[PDB]
Design a protein around this nucleic acid. Structure first.
Lengths: 82, 186, 129, 82, 213, 149
RNA sequence: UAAAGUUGCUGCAGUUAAAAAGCUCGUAGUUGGAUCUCUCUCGGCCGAAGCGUUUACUUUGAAAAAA
């Protein structure tokens, strides 16, 4: 990213899988970026906010996208404990 | 009475020996301590304003000192008020033989006299009524090590309050951070 | 039989990181394994780990942060002087901007940069990047 | 899968494992105080005893060695320790 | 849910689940659906933890709601047991239905007649809807699936653990998902019961309609 | 795996974590020593002694009650055998196989197994000779073996 | 000589392209699990004779014909 002078010399900063932290490639068409709507705690309705989770195509192929997304939602308070 | 090895008396050791003498004068255990002996006794601040007292015992007497350890610790907690008492034997740590030394170790250093074995025995003795049923050394992100000890849940309430005193005593005479917890399985 | 427990440990870490797992179990543990893991941790490559004490030889549960590309052992433990360190870096490291060669020197177990800083050679244990 | 906590296995999963593949190995065997109505003293019997144990106050068989756990004779009360 | 008591599961919902047989899985268990099963029965049937079912249904509803173009959600059903349910869900929620056979190349072949680019994909059965799911792996398509105990979880991002074999269970799950999505959207309230009922989403055998006519 | 077989068996004793005398065991260290001495006088090897101490006396591990291993206890008292138990049993098995082979000379499998047993015997003898348990002149022969049995 | 990673220590191959001995045992060879954190004297803030068991390793120093 940074040269000696400190300016950023990259074309872009690729995003990383929220499950494995590995970089999602430019031609990884099996990768998803899913938004989970946030809900007002009293009315239980869509407040316009959401949590964004990026999952690479490898995890989805392994069948671990379900577990990874469930765990990401649980750590965000979306999913009830247990 | 207290008999030190470096021929040096202490006033707190004198008080501890006086307490042991009082126990010998009037108790149901007078026939027990009349042969047993201690080597030293030290007070250290555990946290906040609390204090804890460590007795030091010769190894051959230690098991005998562990037949009546609970009775004696209860008696000295009653006598010394809000101060916990722990019995840790006096164990010597011989230095690791380096390449530059001279004539003080002509024989191979026994494993029991190593730092590792001595500290393991100190941990085993420091919680005597509860038995050690598991140990986990967690290395934190900065490289420091936290020891987590799992104690027998058969005798938990007798020593649960003694945690944060166990850890302070260990940190004082060993220098390692140690944690104590009780697992569901032994 | 089993030889070079460090090789087995690093292979387990590498295979778990390839699989995307957050934790790996290493058994048996050793002083060399713990020192290598600490050198790995100070550079932020694996994160925290726990030593399970069984009364014959330790085990290590290493939390895995997916920052590790390859951790490898160099068998045999070739003795490396400061002059040959650059050649070893060129052979084993993907870039001059990152990646560490771990050596055991008389000052302890440390990466190649710390070996140059302390001006010492040693025996190459492995590499990680 | 991909997030199994290896430091805190559930007790059922750890009891399911082979005694050597557990996090800390523990035996599946045990010791029992066994007591016969025709005896006035108890004895200690290994759950996997390989010899024929006899009553301390009698001449009766107490347990017969088998492939695994020994076969305690009927009518004898056995209680596990620890 | 998130421990939000407004989102907690109701007695009526539990009764609906138990009546539709939603909690009743199959005799086989995919290793990735272990975490959703309570315990196996005395006859080899796996019981589905309905708390996890409600949790995953709410997560799927949240994912559906965070798409402000409702037609960008595609609801797919190849089996007849979920075609009417999918059509009802699409009508009520505004999604785009594919009831019947899914033509391969729908998501990938730009030239085709039925070409579309959804933003989210929901299917009744990953086994019976394997063709859209695979195409989801070509166009960066998140996927929601109603998964039984033996359902394969490849390319399934939000797996709702439920019986998806019986018509009652499939219809009830689609109806509940539509109800949750509408409740999160704002239309229809969380206080009184929804004016629609699960039997609209059900599937009736042609002999049943003949009996009803 | 096995030294002389393709098996990769895993069965073995799994020791508990604790190194302490069990609560049920009232036997003192000297009592266990006396029981060991009596069992050795009866003519039982340390393996057998440990087996019957575990099975009838509740002694899970003699090392954790006495602080010493059974063979070391017997050596200290002075009633330990001249040659070690495992080597003696290997020599006994080799003698039995050789005695079988003299009356069954067409048993090539017996010859193969005898070769394997004698290789094990030689390995154990070399180990014990390096550790000075056996005299450096000790050698295993095909004639004096039955004398040692 | 490089190309030749077609001699492969770095760094090759051996199911079918060339190729694992028919199969075990076995000596030399090669390899080998965890573990152990600086003292008597001399010319009162010094200086030392050392045997601390050594070796490998590493670093330093000396010495080492120019061309």
């Amino acid at each position: 990213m940074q040269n000696d002078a400190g300016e950023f010399v990259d074309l872009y900063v690729p995003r990383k899988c929220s499950a494995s932290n590995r970089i999602i490639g430019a031609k990884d068409h099996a990768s998803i970026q899913m938004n989970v709507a946030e809900v007002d705690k009293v009315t239980g309705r869509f407040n316009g906010q959401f949590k964004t989770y990026a999952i690479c195509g490898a995890i989805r192929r392994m069948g671990e996208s379900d577990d990874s997304i469930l765990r990401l939602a649980k750590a965000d308070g979306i999913v009830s404990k247990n | 009475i207290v008999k030190p090895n470096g021929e040096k008396p202490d006033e707190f050791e004198s008080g501890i020996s006086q307490a042991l003498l009082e126990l010998e004068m009037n108790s149901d255990l007078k026939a027990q301590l009349r042969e047993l002996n201690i080597t030293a006794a030290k007070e250290i601040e555990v946290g906040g304003g609390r204090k804890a007292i460590i007795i030091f015992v010769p190894v051959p007497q230690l098991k005998s000192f562990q037949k009546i350890q609970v009775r004696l610790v209860r008696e000295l907690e009653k006598k010394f008020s809000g101060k916990h008492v722990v019995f840790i034997a006096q164990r010597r740590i011989l230095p690791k033989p380096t390449r530059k030394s001279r004539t003080k170790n002509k024989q191979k250093r026994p494993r029991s006299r190593t730092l590792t074995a001595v500290h393991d025995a100190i941990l085993e003795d420091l919680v005597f009524p509860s038995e050690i049923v598991g140990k986990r050394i967690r290395v934190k992100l900065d490289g420091s090590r936290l020891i987590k000890v799992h104690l027998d849940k058969a005798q938990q309430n007798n020593v649960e309050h003694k945690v944060e005193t166990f850890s302070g005593v260990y940190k004082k005479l060993t220098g390692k951070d140690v944690n104590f917890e009780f697992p569901e399985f032994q | 039989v089993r030889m070079n427990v460090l090789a087995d440990a690093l292979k387990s870490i590498n295979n778990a990181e390839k699989r995307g797992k957050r934790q790996v179990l290493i058994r048996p543990c050793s002083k060399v394994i713990v020192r290598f893991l600490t050198v790995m941790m100070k550079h932020g490559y694996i994160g925290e780990f726990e030593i399970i004490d069984d009364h014959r030889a330790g085990k290590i549960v290493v939390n895995l942060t997916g920052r590790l590309n390859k951790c490898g052992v160099i068998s045999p433990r070739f003795d490396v002087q400061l002059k040959d360190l650059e050649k070893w870096q060129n052979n084993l490291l993907p870039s001059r901007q990152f990646g560490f060669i771990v050596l055991t020197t008389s000052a302890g177990i440390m990466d190649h940069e710390e070996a140059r800083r302390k001006h010492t050679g040693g025996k190459i244990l492995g590499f990680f990047f | 899968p991909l997030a199994k906590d290896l430091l805190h296995p559930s007790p059922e999963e750890e009891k399911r494992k082979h005694k050597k593949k557990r996090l800390v190995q523990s035996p599946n065997s045990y010791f029992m105080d066994v007591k016969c109505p025709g005896c006035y003293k108890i004895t200690t019997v290994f759950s996997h005893a390989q010899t024929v144990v006899l009553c301390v106050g009698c001449s009766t068989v107490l347990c017969q060695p088998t492939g695994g756990k020994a076969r305690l004779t009927e009518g004898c009360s056995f209680r596990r320790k620890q | 849910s998130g421990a939000l008591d407004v989102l907690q599961m109701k007695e009526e919902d539990v009764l609906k689940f138990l009546a539709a047989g939603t909690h009743l899985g199959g005799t086989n268990l995919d290793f990735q659906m272990e975490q959703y099963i309570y315990k196996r029965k005395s006859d080899g049937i796996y019981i589905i933890n309905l708390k996890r079912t409600w949790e995953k249904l709410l997560l799927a509803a949240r994912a559906i709601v965070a798409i402000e173009n409702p037609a960008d959600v595609s609801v797919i059903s190849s089996r007849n047991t979920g075609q009417r349910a999918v059509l009802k869900f699409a009508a009520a929620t505004g999604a785009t239905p594919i009831a019947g056979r899914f033509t391969p190349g729908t998501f990938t072949n730009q030239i085709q007649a039925a070409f579309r680019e959804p933003r989210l994909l929901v299917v009744t059965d990953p086994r019976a809807d394997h063709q859209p799911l695979t195409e989801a792996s070509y166009v960066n398509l998140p996927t929601i699936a109603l998964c039984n105990t033996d359902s394969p979880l490849r390319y399934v991002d939000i797996a709702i653990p439920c019986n998806n074999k019986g018509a009652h269970s499939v219809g009830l799950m689609w109806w509940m998902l539509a109800r949750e999505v509408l409740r999160m959207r704002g239309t229809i309230s969380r206080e009184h019961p929804w004016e629609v009922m699960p039997d609209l989403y059900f599937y009736r055998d042609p002999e049943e309609i003949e009996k009803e006519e | 795996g096995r030294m002389h077989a393709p098996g990769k068996g895993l069965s073995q004793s799994a020791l508990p974590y604790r190194r302490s005398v069990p609560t049920w065991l009232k036997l003192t260290s000297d009592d266990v020593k006396e029981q060991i001495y009596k069992l050795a006088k009866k003519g039982l090897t340390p393996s057998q002694i440990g087996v019957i101490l575990r099975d009838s006396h509740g002694v899970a591990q003699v090392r954790f009650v006495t602080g010493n291993k059974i063979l070391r206890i017997l050596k200290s008292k002075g009633l330990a055998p001249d040659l070690p138990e495992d080597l003696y049993h290997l020599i006994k098995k080799a003698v039995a196989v050789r005695k079988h082979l003299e009356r069954n000379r067409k048993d090539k499998d017996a010859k193969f197994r005898l070769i394997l047993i004698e290789s094990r015997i030689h390995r154990l003898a070399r180990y014990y000779k390096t550790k000075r348990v056996l005299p450096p002149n000790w050698k295993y022969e095909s004639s004096t073996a039955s004398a040692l049995v």
